[PDB]
Design a protein around this ligand. Structure first.
Ligand SMILES: *[C@@H]1O[C@H](CO[C@@H]2O[C@@H](C)[C@@H](O)[C@@H](O)[C@@H]2O)[C@@H](O[C@@H]2O[C@H](CO)[C@@H](O)[C@H](O)[C@H]2NC(C)=O)[C@H](O)[C@H]1NC(C)=O
Ligand SMILES: *[C@@H]1O[C@H](CO[C@@H]2O[C@@H](C)[C@@H](O)[C@@H](O)[C@@H]2O)[C@@H](O[C@@H]2O[C@H](CO)[C@@H](O)[C@H](O)[C@H]2NC(C)=O)[C@H](O)[C@H]1NC(C)=O
Ligand SMILES: CN(C)CCN(C[C@@H]1CCCN(C2Cc3ccccc3C2)C1)C(=O)c1ccc2ccccc2c1
Ligand SMILES: CN(C)CCN(C[C@@H]1CCCN(C2Cc3ccccc3C2)C1)C(=O)c1ccc2ccccc2c1
Ligand SMILES: *[C@@H]1O[C@H](COC2O[C@@H](C)[C@@H](O)[C@@H](O)[C@@H]2O)[C@@H](O)[C@H](O)[C@H]1NC(C)=O
Ligand SMILES: *[C@@H]1O[C@H](CO)[C@@H](O)[C@H](O)[C@H]1NC(C)=O
Ligand SMILES: *[C@@H]1O[C@H](CO)[C@@H](O)[C@H](O)[C@H]1NC(C)=O
Ligand SMILES: *[C@@H]1O[C@H](CO)[C@@H](O)[C@H](O)[C@H]1NC(C)=O
Ligand SMILES: [Cl-]
Ligand SMILES: [Cl-]
Ligand SMILES: [Cl-]
Length: 527
C-alpha cells in the first residue's frame, strides 16, 4: 500500500510487476477542475484540495472525441481509438515511478498525438511502466481536451479564447513542478516528449512564455508547429467557430452568446458537426487546433522561430521513413490496405486533389512535375510510392527538418533521427512501410517484453532507443555509451548530420531529403 501526499491531497497508487521487478503506478490523478457547464471552452481552472485518499488505480476517462471507424475489427486503426469512457470530465494525468522509490529521478512527460482532434494517454503503446522499470525515470502523461472542446477559438474572448487543450497540458506541467518531488522526481530535470500533434504541442511549449520554467528539454517525434496542419490561422479559426454555430443553431450576433448557446449543446452534437466546419477536408484535416491567441502563443510561431524567441535548450527531433502512407488508405483513389495499391498516373493526380484541395491547378502540377520525373517508367509502384512521399515530405519530414535547422541556428545542440525499421507486428500491409506512429512502441519499450512476439533484433533496437531517449532526458546527449554504439552527432545548420535507427546498421548521414525539402520549404509556400 503506497500513499503519496500531494499539495491537493493524498493519492493511492498500485504496484505492478514488470520484468521480474516492480513499478508503482498512479493512474488517473486529477489536475484541474472538470471543465463542465460554464467551464466548457474556458482555460482549465486549478483544482482545490480534497480530504480523502484519492484512488489512482485505474486510467481515467478520455476526453470527448470522434472515433476512427473506417476499419472496424482491424487492429491497425483501432489500436489508436480511445480505450476508456469518453467524458468532458477528462483532465487527469498518470505517474509511473520505479521501485524502490527514486530519490531525484529525471521526469519524462508524454504528450499524445493525433491531429489535435483525438487521442488519450491510456493507450497501450503509451504505457510508461516499461520506461520506469528499465531506465529508473519517472514517466508522466496527461489527458488534454481535443477538437472543438479543446481548441474552439474566438481570439480575444475569454469565453472561448482558443488553445485550451494547450493550457490543459501546461497546467499538468505545473502539477509536476509542484508535486513530482513527493514521488521522488526532480522538477529541475523534466523532458517533454510527444508524437505528431503531441510533438507539435511540445514545440509550442518551447515558444510559450508560460511554459518556459516548466521543463528542461524536448523531444519531437514526427511533428512540429511549422507543419502545415499544426496551426490554425485567426481568420480560419473564426470562420470555423461561426460555421459550427450555424450547424448547431447557435448563430448569434453577440459572439459571447454564441458561446453560451454552444455551452448548452450536448457533447455529441458538437462532435458530429466538427467535421463540417470546413468546405473541403482531407485525411490531414485539423479542424480545431492551435491558434495565435495572444496568451499561450504571443505571435505567429514562424516569426518567433525565425527570430530566436524560444526556450534555449537541447532538442531531439526525428521522423519515420514512410510518414505519408498511413493517410493514403483513407481517401486516395486506388489505395487499399488489402491490396498492394498499384495506382496509375491518373489516380496519382486525383490523389493530389484529395490531399491539396484548396491548391491551384499550377500548384498541383508542380508537385506532379517534381515527384514523377523518375529513373525508369518501368517500376509499377512508382506512383504509389510518389504519393506517399508527397504526403510524408510536405506534412512531416520537411517541417521537422526546417524546425531543427532554425532552432539550431541560435546555438543549441540538436539531434535528428531517421527511423526506418518496420515492426514485425505491424498490422498494416508491407507496402505502407515504416508508418507514421510506429516508432512509438519502440520508444516506450514494448519490444523488451519477450512474451510479445517481437524479434530479438527488435528487442535490441528498442533497448538502445530507450537508453538514448533517457540519456537525452538525463544529460542532454542521446548516446548509448556502453555497447560500442554509433555516436550520435549534433545536427548543425551546415552539415545537417542525422542518425538512422534500424535493426540492420546504425549510420550517420547528411542532408535528409535535401532536394524534396527545397521544393516544399522554398517554393511551395508561394503557391
Ligand atoms: C467559411 O464558411 C463558408 C460556408 O461553409 C459553409 O457553411 C458551413 C456551416 C459548413 O456547412 C460548410 O461545409 C459550408 O461550406 C465557406 O463557403 C462555401 O465555399 C464553397 C467553396 O469555397 C462554395 O462551393 C460554397 O457555396 C460556399 N458556401 C457558402 C455558404 O458560402 C467558406 O469557404 C469558408 N471560408 C473559408 C476561408 O474556408
Ligand atoms: C485495391 O483496392 C481498391 C479499393 O477497392 C476496394 O478494396 C478491394 C480489396 C476490393 O474489396 C474492392 O471490392 C473494393 O472496391 C481498388 O480501387 C477500386 O477499384 C474499383 C474497380 O472495380 C473501383 O470501382 C473502386 O471505386 C475503387 N475504389 C477506390 C477506393 O479507389 C483498387 O483497384 C485495388 N487495386 C488492385 C486490386 O490492384
Ligand atoms: C499515431 N496516430 C495516433 C495514429 C492515428 N492518426 C493517423 C490517422 C491518419 C488517417 C486517418 N486518421 C483517422 C483519425 C480519425 C478519427 C476519427 C474519425 C476519422 C479519423 C481518421 C488518423 C492520427 O491520430 C492523426 C489524425 C489526424 C492528423 C491530422 C494531421 C496530422 C496528423 C494526424 C494524425
Ligand atoms: C493571416 N494574417 C497574417 C493574420 C494576421 N494576424 C491577425 C492580426 C490581428 C488583427 C489585426 N492585425 C492587423 C493586420 C493589418 C494590416 C493592415 C491593416 C490592418 C491590419 C490588422 C492582424 C495574426 O497573425 C494574429 C492573430 C492573432 C493574434 C493575437 C495576438 C497577437 C498577435 C496576433 C496575430
Ligand atoms: C535534486 O537535484 C537538484 C539539482 O538537479 C539537476 O539540476 C538541473 C539544473 C539540471 O541540470 C538537471 O538535469 C540536474 O539533474 C537539486 O537542486 C535538488 O536539491 C535535488 N533534490 C534532492 C536530491 O532531493
Ligand atoms: C480506494 O481503494 C481501496 C482499495 O484497497 C478501498 O479500500 C477504498 O474504499 C477505495 N476508495 C474509494 C473507492 O473511494
Ligand atoms: C454580449 O452579451 C454578454 C452577456 O450578457 C454581455 O456581457 C456583453 O456585454 C454583450 N456584448 C454586446 C456587444 O452585446
Ligand atoms: C548492453 O549490452 C549488454 C550485453 O553485454 C546488454 O545486456 C544490455 O542490455 C545492453 N544495454 C543497452 C543500453 O543496450
Ligand atoms: Cl452556462
Ligand atoms: Cl497529364
Ligand atoms: Cl554532404
Amino acid at each position: 500500500d503506497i500513499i503519496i501526499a500531494t499539495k491537493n491531497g493524498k493519492v493511492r497508487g498500485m504496484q505492478l510487476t514488470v520484468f521480474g521487478g516492480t513499478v508503482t503506478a498512479f493512474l488517473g490523478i486529477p489536475y484541474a477542475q472538470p471543465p463542465l457547464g460554464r467551464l466548457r471552452f474556458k482555460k482549465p481552472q486549478s483544482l482545490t484540495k480534497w480530504s480523502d485518499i484519492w484512488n489512482a488505480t485505474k486510467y481515467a476517462n478520455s476526453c470527448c472525441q470522434n472515433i476512427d471507424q473506417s476499419f472496424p475489427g482491424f487492429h491497425g486503426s483501432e489500436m489508436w481509438n480511445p480505450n476508456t469512457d469518453l467524458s468532458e470530465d477528462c483532465l487527469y494525468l498518470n505517474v509511473w515511478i520505479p521501485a524502490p522509490k527514486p530519490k531525484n529521478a529525471t521526469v519524462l512527460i508524454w504528450i499524445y498525438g493525433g491531429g489535435f482532434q483525438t487521442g488519450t494517454s491510456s493507450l497501450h503503446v503509451y504505457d510508461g511502466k516499461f520506461l520506469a522499470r528499465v531506465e529508473r525515470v519517472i514517466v508522466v502523461s496527461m489527458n488534454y481536451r481535443v477538437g472543438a472542446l479543446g481548441f474552439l477559438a474566438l481570439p480575444g474572448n475569454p469565453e472561448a479564447p482558443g488553445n485550451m487543450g494547450l493550457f490543459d497540458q501546461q497546467l499538468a506541467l505545473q502539477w509536476v513542478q509542484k508535486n513530482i518531488a513527493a514521488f521522488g522526481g526532480n522538477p529541475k530535470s523534466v523532458t517533454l516528449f510527444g508524437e505528431s500533434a503531441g510533438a507539435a504541442s511540445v514545440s509550442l511549449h518551447l515558444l510559450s512564455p508560460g511554459s518556459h520554467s516548466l521543463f528542461t528539454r524536448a523531444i519531437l517525434q514526427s511533428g512540429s508547429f511549422n507543419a502545415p496542419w499544426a496551426v490554425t490561422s485567426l481568420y480560419e479559426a473564426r470562420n470555423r467557430t461561426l460555421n459550427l454555430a450555424k450547424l448547431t443553431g447557435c448563430s448569434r450576433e453577440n459572439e459571447t452568446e454564441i458561446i453560451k448557446c454552444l455551452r448548452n449543446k450536448d457533447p455529441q452534437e458538437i462532435l458530429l458537426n466538427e467535421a463540417f466546419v470546413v468546405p473541403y477536408g482531407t485525411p490531414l484535416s485539423v479542424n480545431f487546433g492551435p491558434t495565435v491567441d495572444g496568451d499561450f502563443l504571443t505571435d505567429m510561431p514562424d516569426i518567433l522561430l525565425e527570430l530566436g524567441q524560444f526556450k534555449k535548450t537541447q532538442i531531439l527531433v526525428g521522423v519515420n521513413k514512410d510518414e505519408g502512407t498511413a493517410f493514403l488508405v483513407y481517401g486516395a483513389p486506388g489505395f487499399s490496405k488489402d491490396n498492394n495499391s498499384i495506382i496509375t498516373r491518373k489516380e496519382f493526380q486525383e490523389g493530389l486533389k484529395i490531399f491539396f484541395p484548396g491548391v491551384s491547378e499550377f500548384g498541383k502540377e508542380s508537385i506532379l512535375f517534381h515527384y514523377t520525373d523518375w529513373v525508369d517508367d518501368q517500376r509499377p509502384e512508382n506512383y504509389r510510392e510518389a504519393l506517399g512521399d508527397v504526403v510524408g515530405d510536405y506534412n512531416f519530414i520537411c517541417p521537422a527538418l526546417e524546425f531543427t535547422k532554425k532552432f539550431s541556428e541560435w546555438g543549441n545542440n540538436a539531434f535528428f533521427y531517421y527511423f526506418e525499421h518496420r515492426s514485425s507486428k505491424l498490422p498494416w500491409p508491407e507496402w505502407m512501410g515504416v508508418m507514421h506512429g510506429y516508432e512509438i512502441e519502440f520508444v516506450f519499450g514494448l519490444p523488451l517484453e519477450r512474451r510479445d512476439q517481437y524479434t530479438k533484433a527488435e528487442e535490441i533496437l528498442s533497448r538502445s532507443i530507450v537508453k538514448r531517449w533517457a540519456n537525452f532526458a538525463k544529460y542532454g546527449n542521446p548516446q548509448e555509451t556502453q555497447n560500442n554504439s554509433t555516436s550520435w552527432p549534433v545536427f548543425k545548420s551546415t552539415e545537417q548530420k542525422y542518425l538512422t535507427l534500424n535493426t540492420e546498421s546504425t549510420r550517420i548521414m547528411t542532408k535528409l531529403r535535401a532536394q524534396q525539402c527545397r521544393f516544399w520549404t522554398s517554393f511551395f509556400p508561394k503557391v
